[PDB]
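pasting input
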Amino acid sequence: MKKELYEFYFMPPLKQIEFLEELVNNPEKFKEFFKRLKEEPGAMELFLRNLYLMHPMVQIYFLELLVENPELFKLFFEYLEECPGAMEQFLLNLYLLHPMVQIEFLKLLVENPELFRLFFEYLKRCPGALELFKEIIELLDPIIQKYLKKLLEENPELKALVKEV
Amino acid sequence: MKKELYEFYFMPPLKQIEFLEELVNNPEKFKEFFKRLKEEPGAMELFLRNLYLMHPMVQIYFLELLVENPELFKLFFEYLEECPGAMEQFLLNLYLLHPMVQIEFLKLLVENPELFRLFFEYLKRCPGALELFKEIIELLDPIIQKYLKKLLEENPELKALVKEV
Amino acid sequence: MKKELYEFYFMPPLKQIEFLEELVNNPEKFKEFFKRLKEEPGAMELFLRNLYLMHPMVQIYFLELLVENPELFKLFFEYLEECPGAMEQFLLNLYLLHPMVQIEFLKLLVENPELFRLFFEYLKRCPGALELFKEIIELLDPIIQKYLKKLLEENPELKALVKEV
Amino acid sequence: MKKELYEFYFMPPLKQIEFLEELVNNPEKFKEFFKRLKEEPGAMELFLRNLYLMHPMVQIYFLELLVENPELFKLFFEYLEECPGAMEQFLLNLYLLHPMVQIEFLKLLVENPELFRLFFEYLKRCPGALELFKEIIELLDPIIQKYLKKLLEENPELKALVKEV
């Protein structure tokens, strides 16, 4: 186990892009790889620790593969919702992503409103995350905060979800 | 199409300098390469994402090519005048350039006053944007701001342009 | 002598992890390597300067070896305690670690209470260093300060131990 | 000429360390190399622009050669004092050096008080400038400012030397 997740993380980015472009295009390999990450104790938090430390373009290429293959995004965020603490590990890496990555994540959700709402329901069903999530937004810089407001109200129903919390 | 721009972006910097140098040394290749970026849906925002995430020295070498080869700078900021989200996307990635890169970009424009004024007109001829440009001065470190001030005061005309708004 | 520590620092990170994964799995090599670093004049400062500048995953992985091999963690902070000024250089690089590394370091100590208290003793034992540790903990992002309190409060004894100082 | 400084800057760090460890051990090569940088129009500001963007350990290893070969440090701060902008191109990169590098630079001068005095006089002999040095130390982290004050207290003569301006 452990040597695989470091071997992956220390490949050159082109090989990691190729590895993920194989994996999340084949549901039969995706499903069982996330079984491997939960069969070894805590190993899903070692895969996510390695993930958030990647070159930021590989992180956006990964979220671009999931959001555009949404038959696997709802399942992926079911693993991190079922496993306690992993949702808090997500947000406390999301706050630290270099801001182009936060912008591309935000675009990818507001441009696919089903996958925004489904993600936003998991922040209720993993308990107590919303006060931290509101604080993440509140600690962003004034440029990103202004731009996210101007971007979000391109769909005022998602503005209402953001007001409902 | 898109995998070419990833392949390009993941090359070692010397290959990208060599590619961008051979590209903009040939106006007949420059024009059509941007037609390829503009005809594929949305793809120019994916090339520009890959640009702002480059090694900082390749970003200055690229601007150092255009401004000192300016018969292609006049065309380049025409493409970003055409596409209404792209000028917003430029400034809100400019603010996230390294302070040494912002300093060198400002030197590069103020030392070529025609190409300063042309860029400054595009901020008015594109919708909105100009209040982002002002705040993206005002949000910088006090040392950077004093330096960029003591730089621009060399030209009372370019001082008049920035102070007219 | 000095060339070994630069050659090591400039190897690709997999070779460094291989080198450390051998070294602190062999106590007969561990004690010899650190004796060479204490004996050559100032070389223990040059190994630690090269350590805090590493790729953040090699830094996490190194602490992940020591804390789980505590028969060597005991010795390691004995060497720094027997080299006055090194405990200053420790904290004054810890404050500059990437937040994901500080978070994992804290996690590794509170999940191994003996090795938290052992570390905490040397903050008294190196003359007056404790005040710099308290001050550094006050100088972190406000959501990370609350996250470290929420994490530490999982053990009320160690929660008491940081409050009784 | 100009392409040499990019070919150099894009070599792997071991080659740059080798190239510099050859150069500032041979005064006959050192004076010639900087004469080329002085003669080609603006090229010394292109070398310094490439220098301050280096991997931070190469920046320290370079100053660690000069200060310990001070018979070449005296000449080096003729060049950067003679071009009237170049001293500002030091300080407006020095404020942007990573904090561990600024600490190791400061330590390296405080351990050689005559080379500290030599550098400090060149700030006054280059036009104006000294108020930027006072501002730079006032803008560092509170931990760094406190630590540099306690580090400089190791030499009361240099405490007087920084107080007398």
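fyi The CA atoms of residues 79 and 106 of chain A lie 21 Å apart.
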